Write a protein that binds this DNA or RNA. Structure first.
Ligand code: NA
Ligand code: NA
Length: 326
DNA sequence: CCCACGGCCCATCACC
DNA sequence: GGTGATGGGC
DNA sequence: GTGGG
């Protein structure tokens, strides 16, 4: 499908999703609207009626009614109204800052802080994460071309190996499935010295080296197993690269490839694979694959030494990341 | 009618 | 000060 | 808001 097919509808539903999440604080309605937008976005025909749309899984009575109003009038009265609402549109907007969620956005707007410029004038009311989100507001909303992701991966893999050649690092996400662009960089890290049965500095060493070569520029959060921060490719006399979001997670070696599988996705592939695993008497989560007994009691985690090991357990042919869209 | 809709790390708040 | 809750993000 | 038990 292409946009102009049903883009008016899917844009409408996405906008409604955002207000549910950010203003109404109704996360399950947010996801309902998103699910409806997704299934409509994949529908190979231009929708003629709400009833037609209601045949799709995830589109119910209320969304059908909204589609009817949109098709007849070219708008939704409720959406048009909350759009002109100074308070609600401001709350919705501020959540675009990384670190500002529905609660902070509401609190800010309640005390007269509505805009980016208002945040800029009120730095002492922002925590560290929020200050960084504000600083890179525009950059964080840009997508990352695959060519830059490859340059970023080059640096990550090199520096990781430099710290300890026994580290294993994998860049996951849509990038690993071959996407032409990414929203951020997601790095999974492990080391043979770190198992589920098993130093408390393995993640720190890698973050520190990436900071020393001035690739990592800011830290949003950092613990013993999870880093979230900011990075930037070195500038060529040419214009600087945008700052990018990068996550780095340390995973025990015996749970690594379950992790790599999960964080490679897609979300639909994951759901389908876990569905088929149940079929075969296995349960798969982010960490392990375990056999299910005859009454449904999960046994010990099975040995996994590759992604293929997982596919083999559930009698499925290994599918390359490229072939994991669903 | 009524409940699920992912779960967990990290930063920070709420309270003791 | 310590412990658990909450917000945020993915 | 939707689906399903
Ligand atoms: Na439906
Ligand atoms: Na935000």
């Amino acid at each position: 499908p292409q946009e102009t097919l049903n883009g008016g509808i899917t844009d409408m539903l996405t906008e409604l999703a955002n207000f549910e999440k950010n203003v109404s604080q109704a996360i399950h309605k947010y996801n309902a609207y998103r699910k409806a937008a997704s299934v409509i976005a994949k529908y190979p025909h231009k929708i003629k009626s709400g009833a037609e749309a209601k045949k799709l899984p995830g589109v119910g009575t209320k969304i059908a009614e909204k589609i009817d109003e949109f098709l007849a009038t070219g708008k939704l009265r409720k959406l048009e109204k909350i759009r002109q609402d100074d308070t609600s549109s401001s709350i919705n907007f501020l959540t675009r800052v990384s670190g500002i969620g529905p609660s902070a956005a509401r609190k800010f707007v309640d005390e007269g802080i509505k805009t980016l410029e208002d945040l800029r004038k009120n730095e002492d009311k922002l925590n560290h994460h929020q200050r960084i989100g504000l600083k890179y507001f525009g950059d964080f909303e840009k997508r990352i071309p695959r060519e830059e992701m490859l340059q970023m991966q080059d640096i990550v893999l090199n520096e990781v190996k430099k710290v300890d050649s026994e580290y294993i690092a994998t860049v996951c996400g849509s990038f690993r499935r071959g996407a032409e662009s990414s929203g951020d960089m997601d790095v999974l890290l492990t080391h043979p010295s770190f198992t589920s049965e098993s130093q408390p500095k393995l993640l720190h060493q890698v973050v520190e080296q990436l900071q020393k070569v001035h690739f990592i520029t800011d830290t949003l959060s950092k613990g013993e197993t999870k880093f979230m921060g900011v990075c930037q490719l070195p500038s060529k006399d040419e214009k600087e690269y945008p700052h990018r979001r990068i996550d780095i997670r340390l995973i025990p070696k015996d749970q690594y490839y379950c992790g790599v599988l999960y964080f490679t996705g897609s979300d639909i592939f994951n759901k389908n694979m876990r569905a088929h695993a149940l079929e075969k008497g296995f349960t798969i989560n982010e960490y392990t694959i375990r056999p299910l007994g005859v009454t449904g009691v999960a046994g010990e985690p099975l040995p996994v030494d590759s992604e293929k090991d997982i596919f083999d357990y559930i009698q499925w042919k290994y599918r390359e990341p490229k072939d994991r869209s669903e």
